[PDB]
From a paper:
All trans retinoic acid (RA) and its synthetic analogs, referred to as retinoids, play crucial roles in a wide variety of biological processes including embryonic morphogenesis and organogenesis, cell proliferation, differentiation and apoptosis, homeostasis, as well as in their disorders. These pleiotropic effects are mediated through retinoic acid receptors (RARs) consisting of three subtypes, α (NR1B1), β (NR1B2), and γ (NR1B3) belonging to the nuclear hormone receptor superfamily. RARs are modular proteins composed of several domains, most notably a DNA-binding domain (DBD) and a C-terminal ligand-binding domain ([name]), acting as ligand-regulated transcription factors by forming heterodimers with the retinoid X receptor ([name], NR2B). To provide structural evidence of LG754 activity toward [name] and [name], we crystallized [name]α or [name]β LBDs in the presence of LG754 and of a coactivator-derived peptide.
LG754 ligands could be precisely placed in their respective electron density in the two LBDs as shown by the experimental omit electron density maps, confirming that LG754 can bind to both [name] and [name]. Comparison of the LG754-bound [name]α [name] structure with that of the previously reported [name]α [name] bound to the full agonist CD3254 reveals some residue reorientations, the most significant one affecting L436 in helix H11. In the presence of CD3254, this leucine has a pivotal role in inducing the sharp turn on the LBP volume to accommodate the twisted ligand and in stabilizing the active conformation of H12. In contrast, our structure shows that L436 undergoes a significant conformational change and rotates toward H12 to accommodate the propoxy group of LG754. This conformer generates a steric clash with L455 from helix H12 accounting for the destabilization of the active conformation of H12 in solution. In both cases, the bulky side chains act as antagonistic extensions, lowering the interaction strength between H12 and the [name] surface and accounting for the very weak agonistic profile of these ligands. This is in line with a previous crystal structure of [name]α in complex with LG754 showing a non-active [name]α [name] conformation with the C-terminal H12 flipping out to the solvent. As a consequence, the tetrahydronaphtalene group of LG754 points toward helix H12 in [name]β, whereas, in [name]α, a rotation by about 90° around the C9-C10 orients the ring away from helix H12. Overall, our data defines LG754 as a dual ligand exerting a strong [name] and a weak [name] agonistic activity.
Residue numbers in the entry:
A (entry chain A), C (entry chain A): 229 to 243, 263 to 460
B (entry chain B), D (entry chain B): 686 to 697
């Protein structure tokens, strides 16, 4: 079973600008662990597979969360620390292009379709249950969980938004953008560490340990 | 061996 | 209108190993233009938007095609030139990791679910009609075309495979893997050109012209 | 200015 009520409850329970962004991301990695523990059946996976899924998905999972948090912000994002990052500030820090991708491909699209927190939570749970993550002890088990999430999400969409038959597909089709943006953010983070001019806290730093890609 | 993540996952 | 019969017809109409792969990719870029012209309404977009969509999607579109072509091949892919590339050969050429991602995340998954050519064609048309492509004169127009493709694909899946309610979602959820793999292949191609030890033909080389990313 | 792609798209 994979009830969307549990997924929403998980969202509601966890309810240099680049330095501020790194500080917020490290903070939210702790909260991400507590969120995942609230997603049905995640905690019943083998401990090493829980590690794999979170190491593989953390950047997309965090991006989805702060993007949805920012749907009412104009030309900016709300960090979990209560700070706002304006697109002019991101641009002034040398990360304007990828920041604009988040605003254009994620935040604005979430705003335009009024993606709700149940839908957000379900998309994040799909990202979490990534059966292509390398090293999983039982990929089919993770694929089965992803399939239960999407089945539940579609039923929710069809019941709450029956006038929008394409809505379920529209939600899923933000995931390629999320994957591209997540990959680019990781590239930036490896550069920040290489140059050494940006503090990176311990949990964020641990995500940079091998394995990579 | 992903020390922080393991510790946070294993606890209650 | 966006009938899946036209999309299938488009597929059927176009029905150092790294050097062999580069030669095949250049050859298939010409065929990709002829395929796109056969996808309903693509040719009615402004010429500059046709250019944008193909420049943005060529690598994912070609990867999807040779992956589906290879579903009956064991541990390898069939190039459009009639050559087979075995995973041992890819490994012996220094590109084993990304080759294995194609086999594992795309070819095997297409084989496991017996993805058919209508479904392949529809997924490629969704990739083609990418409304996030930078520079489009009318993104909403491209988004509308993508929505017509997915609506048609879902109806096809529900009619042909009614016993598999999750099949439409399962097809869409190979697109994040396709996007990641496509991005990695492009990274390799820029390296091949930088080192200069791999011939790159004119159409493939033109895809490397700016703009990038 | 993407010479080959334009030529192939514009033709019949
Ligand atoms: C962390 C550093 C590398 O990862 C990132 C780098 C960047 C970004 C995000 C992340 C990620 C992956 C997560 C951010 C999470 C936060 C900030 C969550 C929150 O507050 O709830 C955005 C905001 C798109 C701006 C561009 C750069 C390249 C600086
Ligand atoms: C072209 C060179 C950069 O793009 C690629 C590079 C690579 C690959 C594919 C592509 C792409 C994007 C397309 C290939 C199309 C073909 C070969 C089509 C066909 O015959 O119909 C695979 C096969 C995954 C092996 C790994 C490397 C890195 C060598």
């Amino acid at each position: 079973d994979m009830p969307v009520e549990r997924i929403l409850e998980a969202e509601l329970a966890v309810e240099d600008p680049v330095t501020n962004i790194c500080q917020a991301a490290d903070k939210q990695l702790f909260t991400l662990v507590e969120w995942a523990k609230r997603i049905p059946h995640f905690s019943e996976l083998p401990l090493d597979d829980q590690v794999i899924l979170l190491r593989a998905g953390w950047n997309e999972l965090l991006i989805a969360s702060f993007s949805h948090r920012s749907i009412a912000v104009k030309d900016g994002i709300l960090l979990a620390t209560g700070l706002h990052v304006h697109r002019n500030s991101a641009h002034s820090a040398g990360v304007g292009a990828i920041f604009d991708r988040v605003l254009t491909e994620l935040v604005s699209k979430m705003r335009d379709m009024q993606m709700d927190k149940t839908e957000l939570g379900c998309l994040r749970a799909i990202v979490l249950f990534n059966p292509d993550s390398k090293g999983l002890s039982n990929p089919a088990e993770v694929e089965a969980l992803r399939e239960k999430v999407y089945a539940s999400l579609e039923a929710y969409c069809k019941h709450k938004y029956p006038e929008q038959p394409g809505r379920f597909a529209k939600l899923l089709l933000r995931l390629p953008a999320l994957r591209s943006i997540g990959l680019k953010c990781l590239e930036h983070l490896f550069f920040f560490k290489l140059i050494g001019d940006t503090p990176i806290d311990t949990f964020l730093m641990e995500m940079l340990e091998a394995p990579h890609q | 061996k992903h020390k922080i993540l393991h510790r946070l996952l294993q606890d209650s």
